[PDB]
Design a protein around this ligand. Structure first.
Ligand code: ACO
Ligand code: ACO
Ligand code: N3Q
Ligand code: G6P
Ligand code: G6P
Lengths: 165, 165
């Protein structure tokens, strides 16, 4: 299936305009399993082993929530996935039933790093978040990659704390 | 309506066992609008103005997702809400289609602070997260409240970064 996860109208036109020639940013679709999506996530952390039937199940759970999960991909000239980025919109009671944008799982293929593809992904995810009416966008990072997020216009706002099971 | 948001079986029995006499922790229900729920959230940040019809709409959106949004309350001997705590379970592709527990919007009524109610809320939310199969629980905090989260068993794991709109 080639049906976008969410509306292509949510993709930043200004970002599309300034990508390198023949590169694009678009919503995830189900067939992206075959276009090297999970490969790109291997630069981020352990993906483990995921067959197409498991893919299709998780894809459908997410599609049943395309009003929360905004997953998009960067594609090169040859339609290969070279970049990934997620926004998850949390609904709150606070801030007059406000909404918070959470940026997750930003990855660019090693051979493709250092070309602004990460920046375009963040600019696209910030465009989605503003447009669906989030009051702020937040994310968690390491010391080692804080400087990328500063170059994207993010500011330090507190501490991530964790409990492992 | 007095129907729990989620199954009371997800409430930590060990936490219920050690609360102060006549205090309880239970899932949110829709009638909690009248039991001072939003009052408690006033200690956390701006709630703004929220009528019962807006409450009912947001409550129903969340109930349509009680497999993601685990909101629970602490009640005193007189059935007043004195504490609130949220877990939101993110679905991932990474970690073999893993799940991450996000702790949000922890609040205890000022007159009721310093009695372990915050600790019981975190222990209850960590019980939910393990039980539905999260690989870790994370949250964002300030320097000023990092020491509460350390006493709860959390460790510093990175930086929260933010963009405001
Ligand atoms: C919320 C999260 O998901 S945090 C997890 C982030 N992901 C990872 O760490 C996975 C591994 N790394 C990557 O996949 C990528 O390198 C990313 C996404 C961090 C950055 O993407 P790239 O395409 O490599 O970066 P891009 O070229 O857009 O960088 C923008 C600017 O930041 C700089 N930059 C990139 N990474 C870093 C860094 N770690 N520290 C400081 N500066 C950096 C670039 O040099 C560029 O600088 P310029 O504007 O002065 O040219
Ligand atoms: C993920 C998030 O939501 S972060 C936002 C947190 N919420 C807020 O900041 C709102 C305002 N504060 C509150 O509502 C509450 O005070 C809470 C939730 C922070 C803590 O709840 P309380 O019921 O006050 O704390 P509780 O009594 O369970 O505290 C556990 C221990 O931590 C201590 N503690 C409580 N707050 C702090 C703090 N800010 N710094 C250091 N230690 C603290 C207590 O003294 C207690 O110590 P002990 O085990 O040595 O007795
Ligand atoms: O900054 C993103 C990390 N957080 C904050 C606390 O862990 C986060 C991430 C997601 Cl993806 C979510 C979320 N998950 N589903 C809906 N929203 C929430 Cl509440 C918080
Ligand atoms: O595999 P983990 O330990 O969860 O880390 C994987 C990544 O997930 C999230 O998107 C966080 O923003 C990153 O800080 C983290 O690098
Ligand atoms: O009103 P905000 O600026 O979003 O802050 C309100 C709270 O929301 C979240 O639960 C965060 O964990 C806290 O760090 C923050 O205090």
């Amino acid at each position: 299936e080639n049906t976008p996860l969410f509306s292509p109208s949510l993709i930043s036109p200004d970002v599309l305009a300034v990508l390198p020639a023949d590169y694009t940013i678009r919503p995830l679709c189900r067939s992206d399993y075959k276009r090297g999506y999970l490969d790109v996530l291997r630069v981020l952390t352990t993906v483990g082993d995921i067959n197409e039937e498991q893919w299709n199940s998780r894809y459908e759970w997410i599609r049943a929530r395309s009003d929360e999960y905004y997953l998009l991909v960067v594609c090169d000239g040859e339609g290969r996935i070279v970049g990934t980025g997620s926004l998850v919109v949390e609904r709150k009671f606070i801030h007059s039933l406000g909404m918070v944008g959470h940026i997750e799982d930003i990855a660019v293929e090693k051979g493709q790093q250092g070309k602004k593809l990460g920046l375009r992904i963040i600019q696209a995810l910030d465009y989605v978040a503003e447009k669906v009416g989030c009051y702020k966008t937040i994310l968690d990072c390491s010391e080692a990659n804080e400087g990328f997020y500063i170059k994207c216009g993010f500011k330090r706002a507190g501490l991530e704390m964790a409990h492992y099971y």
